[PDB]
Amino acid sequence: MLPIEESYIENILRLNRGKTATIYMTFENSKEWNSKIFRGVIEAAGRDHIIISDPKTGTRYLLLTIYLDYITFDEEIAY
Amino acid sequence: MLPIEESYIENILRLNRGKTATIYMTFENSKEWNSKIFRGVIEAAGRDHIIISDPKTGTRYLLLTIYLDYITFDEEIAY
Amino acid sequence: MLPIEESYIENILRLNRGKTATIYMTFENSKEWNSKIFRGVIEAAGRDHIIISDPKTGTRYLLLTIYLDYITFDEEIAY
Amino acid sequence: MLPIEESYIENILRLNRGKTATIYMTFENSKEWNSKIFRGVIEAAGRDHIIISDPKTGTRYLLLTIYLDYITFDEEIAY
Amino acid sequence: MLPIEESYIENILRLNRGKTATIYMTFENSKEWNSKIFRGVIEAAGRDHIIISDPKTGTRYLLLTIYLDYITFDEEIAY
Amino acid sequence: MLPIEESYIENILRLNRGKTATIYMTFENSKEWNSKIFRGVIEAAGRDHIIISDPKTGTRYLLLTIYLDYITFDEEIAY
Amino acid sequence: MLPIEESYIENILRLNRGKTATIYMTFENSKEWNSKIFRGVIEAAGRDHIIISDPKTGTRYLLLTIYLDYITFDEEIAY
Amino acid sequence: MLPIEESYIENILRLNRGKTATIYMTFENSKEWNSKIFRGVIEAAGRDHIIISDPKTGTRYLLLTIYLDYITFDEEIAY
Amino acid sequence: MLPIEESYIENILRLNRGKTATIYMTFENSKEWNSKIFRGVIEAAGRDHIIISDPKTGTRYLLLTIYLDYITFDEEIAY
Amino acid sequence: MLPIEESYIENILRLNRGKTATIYMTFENSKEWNSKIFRGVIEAAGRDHIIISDPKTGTRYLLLTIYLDYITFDEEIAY
Amino acid sequence: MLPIEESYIENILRLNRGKTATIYMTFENSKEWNSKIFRGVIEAAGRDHIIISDPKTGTRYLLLTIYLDYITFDEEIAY
Amino acid sequence: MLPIEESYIENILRLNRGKTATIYMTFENSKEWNSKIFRGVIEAAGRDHIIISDPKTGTRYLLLTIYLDYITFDEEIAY
Amino acid sequence: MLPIEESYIENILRLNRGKTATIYMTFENSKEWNSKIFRGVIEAAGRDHIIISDPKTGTRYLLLTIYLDYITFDEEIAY
Amino acid sequence: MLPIEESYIENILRLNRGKTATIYMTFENSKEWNSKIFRGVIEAAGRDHIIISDPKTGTRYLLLTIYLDYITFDEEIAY
Amino acid sequence: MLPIEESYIENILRLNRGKTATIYMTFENSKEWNSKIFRGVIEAAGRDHIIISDPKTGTRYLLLTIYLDYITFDEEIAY
Amino acid sequence: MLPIEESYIENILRLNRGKTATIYMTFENSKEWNSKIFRGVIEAAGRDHIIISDPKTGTRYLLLTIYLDYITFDEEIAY
Amino acid sequence: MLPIEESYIENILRLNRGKTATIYMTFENSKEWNSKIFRGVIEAAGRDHIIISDPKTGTRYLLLTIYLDYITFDEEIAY
Amino acid sequence: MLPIEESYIENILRLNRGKTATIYMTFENSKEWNSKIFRGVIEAAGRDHIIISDPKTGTRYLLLTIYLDYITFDEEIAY
């Protein structure tokens, strides 16, 4: 388990590469996509991106953590 | 009890891992989830996340402290 | 009585642990709780939280001082 | 009378502890209390608070100077 | 007359203590007092306040220069 | 004529003390005076004020350069 | 695969020059193009631009990463 | 032609003193002049002003570059 | 081709002096020109301007890169 | 009284062992204790320390003279 | 008691091996630990280290005196 | 009058023991006392201290000459 | 146990070759690694390096003592 | 006239005791007096002080040459 | 193994010519390369340089030890 | 012409007493005069001062060479 | 190959006169050229300069080693 | 060609008196001239100055080598 001094969002996202996650993300000023729900499998997350790979259709998204609001897992968040 | 110089929000959240908490959180600009009420059991809280594990359905949320507004406990806040 | 150089909000809140206080707090952008009135007994206040313990129902709130607007006491503010 | 280099708002508020003052204060984003008029007797003012003690009902307010707009005295501002 | 390097607003306000001035001031976000016109006699002005003493009723205001918009004199601005 | 390194707004305003100027100024958030047109004779301009002396009625304004938008002269801008 | 300390958005965009990408981008304040969907082939991406070359019509866009919201790939994000 | 390290807006405006220019300028928050079109002859431009001298009526404007949006020339921009 | 450390927007704009470009630009707060489409030939681009020379009518615009949103080329972006 | 050649800070601090002193001390770069006010009774002061013994709670501090700013006595500085 | 010529910080720290001390230490430029409070029992202190042995968990720290700010004892500083 | 070779600050401060002086002093990095104005009667000044004895309240300060900026006398500086 | 005259940091680090240590180190000016936590087994420490050999993955670090802040042991610091 | 080897600032300041001088001085880190303009008559200047005696009000300043920036005379600098 | 008196950084770097090393280096004040990760094979290291020869592309870097922060080896640091 | 061993700044400034010079000087930390342009006639320059005598108004400046940045002559620098 | 006692940066730069080098250099405080990439052929390097002769355009730079950060060769560093 | 022991910057600048040079110089803390580009003909360079004589307008600059960053020649650096 990570200590206090490095338990940031990106480190935990990198500890759970392969967990079915649904990311609730909200882009500040839009008219067509004001709030988005990216469901899929986290393939890899850097400190400015969360590469989500939806297996239903195969579209590997590339989100930006700046607009992230909250990630809902389903099995076990390994911290 | 923590001294004055380190009694921040995250330290107290880390002192009460295992207390039934309902977090009232508000995302700044959304159309679908402007205000959310995350009820559950705090499993672990870093300095940029609060891993809430709802036991009713099993969805382990991963919130962001930036959008936090206030946490309502029910038993005893250990500070 | 505190000198000028350390008479901040949190220090006074820490000098009155146990006074019936009603905190008028306002969250910036919400649709459901735009303004809240947290009534109760101040149990302990750090520099980023005000643990209010309502004795009517037992829900020990944990507010954030950032959103604080003003605290109405009823007996004696000890400064 | 204070010199130029220390004639700030809080210093003058501390020079007039005991003057009937009506503070016109405005909280930025509220729906229920957008503008408030706190009338009473200034008991003590630090650099982040103005402890106003209304003698009509006895509720000793604790305002925040950040939201202050202007203070109307009635007898003599001692500067 | 002040040189260029110290001809700020507060210095001139301090050079004209005793001139009938009408201060047009505007508080950013209010519903009841969005724009105010404080008419009176400038008694003393520091670097964060302008103590205006209306002689019609005797209410010695204490404004904040941050919200100042413009001061209309009537006789002679001594700079 | 001023060099490049000191040709700011206030320096030029100080080079034309005595020119009939109409200052188009706009206060950010007001309900009664959102845009103002101060016509008159520039008596003296510091780095935070433009003392305009209207000769029609004699009211010597004292504007703030922060809210300035643009100054329309009529004879000759001496730079 | 990039380490943690250089896994930014632009580096990954530069690792996938030649992948069919649809960039969902949103310009903050517009009336005609508030949200745009730039579909095409990423030719080259610096740290302030993403040169997308649509092959349907031949218009080689030049976007700005500041307004980027999220990039949807279709085959394989190489990180 | 100016090098890269000093090819700013004001330098070019100073290289074309005497070219018929129409400056499209927009003041942020106004009710009466939200967008203005200053047509005329550029007499001299410092780093915080663009002295435009309309020859049709003789009103020598003095704009502020902060509110500038774009300048439409008609003959030749000398850079 | 430019390296990573100097591949900014202005450098590329300077590498393609002479390419038919249509710049989609948006001024933040306007009522008459909220979004503009400047079509023409890029003559020269500094780090705060993009001198576009429309050959249809001859009006050599002088835009500001701050308000730039995205540039659509038509032939070949040389990076 | 000490001569000129040995009247340093530490010598005088050693001549007044037993005087109620409030030391205003400031640590250069801190986020939690940027300025501290150590009130108490000076028990002994070497050339790199000032052992202050607060009698209110009994915590015998051990400050460092390097960070000292100024000592306020209350009765008589014996030099 | 030590004479004047050798009463430095390290000598006194070596005279009190075994006193419950809380060292308030501040590292100059950090983002995660800008100010630290090392509580424990001083086991041994050289001239460049203060081996603090916390008995609560058993982690024997090894601090550096360069970053020391001030040590708060609780029983008796033997000098 | 002192010769050139010994006319330092401390010597003159020692020649005027008993003159009402207001010392304008500035501590380098503070949040609460960045600039202080110590008014009083100079009782004695060594080469690292200026014992100022305010007679209004009786608090005999002990400043440090390192942080001194300038001393304003009122009657006669004897040099 | 080392005497006073040679009890420096490097000597003690050399007396404990083989103790599980977590070194909290902070590099002065970085954007990606401002604070690092090197956990492992100290293999050998000279006077300008601390060869830490993490056994989890096998990466034998080579730190620099200049940037060291503090070393947390876990079993016994032999001095 | 002084030779090259002793024509320092203090020597010239001592050659012009009695010349109306305005000293432009700047204290490094202040919030209230960042730049000061001491106007008056130079009474005597040592090698660490410039005793300026303003005759308008009678306050005989005592500046420090370390913070000096430049002295503007008005009649004749005798060197 | 080197003795204590010559176990510096450069000597050890010279004892491991031919070990795959990743040097984490940070240049103090840059906008484009604030932190760099030079991965490769150490060919030779003097006392002011570390000639790293990346075999992936063949670019033989020449770093400066002054900016070095820490070197991560992978096989065996021979000291 | 001076040899190599004595061709310093002050010697050349002393060889051109009487040349119209504009000294571009910059004081390190100021809010009102961060950069100054002293235009005039060099009357005499020692090794710590440059007595510039502006003939337009008669104010004989006395600059300090420490803050000098560069001197622009107009006729002939005699070296 | 140079021995240990003279293997400095300048000696090696002088051993490779004629190797295509790209010098990554960073000037401490600039607004226009904060980081520069000088690509070319090293013609000659003294102990305070590196005469780089770019053959693309013919501009023979003359850098300063003080601001050097790191030199990337491409063929063979001869040490 | 100069030997190693005297190949400094000033010696080479003195070997090329008469070469068209553009000196890129940067003054540390300025608001108006943070970076300057002095183009011209080097007339003579001592060890603390570089007398550049621009022939376009005739202003013979006198720079200071301390602020020098790098000199770009155009024909041949004779070393």
Author numbering:
A (entry chain J), B (entry chain H), C (entry chain G), D (entry chain F), E (entry chain E), F (entry chain D), ...: 91 to 169
Authors' text:
GerQ has been reported to function by recruiting CwlJ, a protein responsible for hydrolyzing the cortex peptidoglycan surrounding dormant spores and essential for Ca2+-DPA induced spore germination. The spores are enveloped by a proteinaceous, self-assembled, multilayered structure known as the spore coat. GerQ assembles into a structurally stable architecture consisting of rings containing nine subunits, which stacks to form filaments.
In this study, we re-process the previous cryo-EM data and successfully determine the structure of these 8 nm filaments at a resolution of 3.3 Å. These layers are related to each other by helical symmetry with a rise of 34.2 Å and a twist of −18.4°. Within each layer, the nine GerQ subunits are related to each other with C9 point group symmetry. It comprises two α-helixes, five β-strands, and connecting loops that link these secondary structures. The bowl-like structure formed by the nine subunits features a wide opening (∼39 Å) on one side and a narrow opening (~17 Å) on the other side.
